[PDB]
Amino acid sequence: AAIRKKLVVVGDGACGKTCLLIVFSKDEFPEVYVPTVFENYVADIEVDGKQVELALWDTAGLEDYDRLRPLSYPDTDVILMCFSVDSPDSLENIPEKWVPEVKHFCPNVPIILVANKKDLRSDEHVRTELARMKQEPVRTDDGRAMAVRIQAYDYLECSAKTKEGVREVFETATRAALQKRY
Ligand SMILES: Nc1nc2c(ncn2[C@@H]2O[C@H](COP(=O)(O)OP(=O)(O)OP(=O)(O)O)[C@@H](O)[C@H]2O)c(=O)[nH]1
Ligand SMILES: [Mg+2]
Ligand SMILES: [Mg+2]
Numbered sequence: 177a178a179i180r181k182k183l184v185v186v187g188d189g190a191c192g193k194t195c196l197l198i199v200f201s202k203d204e205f206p207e208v209y210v211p212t213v214f215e216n217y218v219a220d221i222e223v224d225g226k227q228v229e230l231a232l233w234d235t236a237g238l239e240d241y242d243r244l245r246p247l248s249y250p251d252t253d254v255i256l257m258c259f260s261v262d263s264p265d266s267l268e269n270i271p272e273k274w275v276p277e278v279k280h281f282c283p284n285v286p287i288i289l290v291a292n293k294k295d296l297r298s299d300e301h302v303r304t305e306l307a308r309m310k311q312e313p314v315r316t317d318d319g320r321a322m323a324v325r326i327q328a329y330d331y332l333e334c335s336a337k338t339k340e341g342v343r344e345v346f347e348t349a350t351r352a353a354l355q356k357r358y
Pocket of ligand 3: 339340
């Protein structure tokens with residue numbers, strides 16, 4: 177008799193949402209990038225002595241699918257709002273697009289702000305490319321500051337590619353889902 181909770185992930189195209197969900201749920205890292213249209217995966221986790229049957233709702237980051245995405249939002253217990261550290265613009269798009277959308281359709285649902293691809297923070301090619309545009313990989317303090325700005329439940333960083341931090345994202349999201357207030 178496990179408790180069911182619904183998790184929805186949102187954020188810019190190619191920022192790492194599917195790989196995060198599939199590494200967590202299957203311990204596989206998909207090797208070919210296919211933009212998502214709509215999926216709903218199953219997973220299980222135990223948090224604070226509670227066994228949870230998680231539904232993981234994967235959404236399209238591409239704005240081509242903006243009209244379909246809200247079909248995923250009803251009755252959500254926790255949102256993962258993702259950006260990637262190699263893409264400062266993916267962080268800018270958090271307040272520009274993702275926060276207004278989720279506030280419209282998911283009022284009062286806890287949000288975990290998640291920095292994906294943390295393995296790229298030190299990558300020399302990423303650094304070189306961003307420096308040409310007078311940018312840098314997203315710093316932890318800037319991610320945390322965005323989390324405070326947008327009133328997120330928490331801020332966490334991970335790499336689906338190495339698995340660093342992945343378990344903690346889902347433990348914290350599950351705890352947020354369990355404490356959701358009405
Ligand atoms: N270096 C690195 N690359 C990653 C990581 N996670 C995903 N990627 C790569 O980033 C690309 C996009 O990853 P996805 O997880 O498919 O991105 P998405 O956010 O689901 O994209 P949409 O479905 O189009 O919204 C792929 O080439 C992945 O292999 C990570 O942790 N580190
Ligand atoms: Mg995807
Ligand atoms: Mg670890």
